[PDB]
Design an enzyme around this catalytic site. Structure first.
Site, PDB file in Angstrom:
ATOM      1  N   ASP A   9     -27.682  47.064  -8.670  1.00  0.00           N
ATOM      2  CA  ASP A   9     -28.161  45.824  -8.097  1.00  0.00           C
ATOM      3  C   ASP A   9     -29.573  46.078  -7.561  1.00  0.00           C
ATOM      4  OD1 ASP A   9     -27.605  43.762  -5.348  1.00  0.00           O
ATOM      5  OD2 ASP A   9     -27.312  43.217  -7.465  1.00  0.00           O
ATOM      6  N   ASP A  11     -31.882  44.001  -4.840  1.00  0.00           N
ATOM      7  CA  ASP A  11     -32.235  43.888  -3.383  1.00  0.00           C
ATOM      8  C   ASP A  11     -31.163  44.533  -2.452  1.00  0.00           C
ATOM      9  OD1 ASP A  11     -34.331  42.531  -1.289  1.00  0.00           O
ATOM     10  OD2 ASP A  11     -32.381  41.671  -0.737  1.00  0.00           O
TER      11      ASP A  11
END
Length: 240
Positions: A9, A11
């Site tokens: 992922d 952020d």
């Protein structure tokens, strides 16, 4: 085992929230890419991923999957561009839209503003108040919604109306809900990787929104991380 891929992922996994990736982190990943393939997935669009990971993002990762992998890059080259209207067809698109327009027109509320339907490549975001409302207007809606369950009911109504059509619904935040084809969460990106011979596909991210499906999907070995320092700690433990 074997040839393997790490997918991260973006952020909070690779970056501090709302901050660009660090040189230290970046050097860490490029060193890791020596031994295992790396890719990134996120709900944001390509320009956002650039801001977070750098403009040369496609040279830095073996795969890059903005918008849940509806946009895909492999080895620096644009692989696929998929959107909701091509998957679902225009007539269904428009039947969903027409229903939501007429329903919103019938909901009694203290205020209505605009952007009742926000059209995204991967979803229709629908808001009975309209996404343009101010902060105070949203709070008012949200308390009404808690008492009245306006979004829950619209979603239930839609779920009945469009049974058989292969759509999922998702309420969150204070003013809107999302309508998108089944499996159009981060899991979407797996179609681009699952035929490149990897014996293991690691996923590094949040395990919980509820539940992130890519984390729990049978193809991935999911690892939840709390911060880039953590991602590094676990990558050190697994690899090397």
């Amino acid at each position: 085992p074997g040839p393997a891929l790490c997918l991260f992922d973006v952020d909070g996994t690779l970056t501090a929230p709302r901050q660009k990736i660090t040189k230290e982190m970046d050097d860490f990943l490029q060193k890791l890419r020596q031994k295992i393939k790396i890719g990134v997935v996120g709900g944001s669009d390509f320009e956002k991923v650039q801001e977070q990971l750098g403009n040369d993002v496609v040279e830095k990762y073996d795969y890059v999957f903005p918008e849940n992998g509806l946009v895909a890059y492999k080895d620096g080259k644009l692989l696929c561009r998929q959107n909701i209207q091509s998957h679902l067809g225009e007539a269904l698109i428009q039947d969903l839209i027409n229903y939501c327009l007429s329903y919103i027109a019938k909901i009694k509320l203290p205020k209505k503003r605009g952007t009742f339907i926000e059209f995204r490549n991967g979803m229709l975001n629908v808001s009975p108040i309209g996404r343009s409302c101010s902060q105070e207007e949203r709070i008012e809606f949200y308390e009404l919604d808690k008492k009245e369950n306006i979004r829950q009911k619209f979603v239930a109504d839609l779920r009945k109306e469009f049974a058989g059509k292969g759509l999922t619904f998702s309420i969150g935040g204070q003013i809107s809900f999302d309508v998108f084809p089944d499996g159009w969460d981060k899991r979407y990106c797996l179609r681009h990787v699952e035929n490149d011979g990897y014996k293991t596909i690691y996923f590094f991210g949040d395990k919980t929104m509820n539940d992130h499906e890519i984390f729990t999907d049978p193809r991935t070995m999911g690892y939840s991380v709390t911060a880039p320092e953590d991602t590094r700690r676990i990558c050190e433990l697994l690899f090397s």
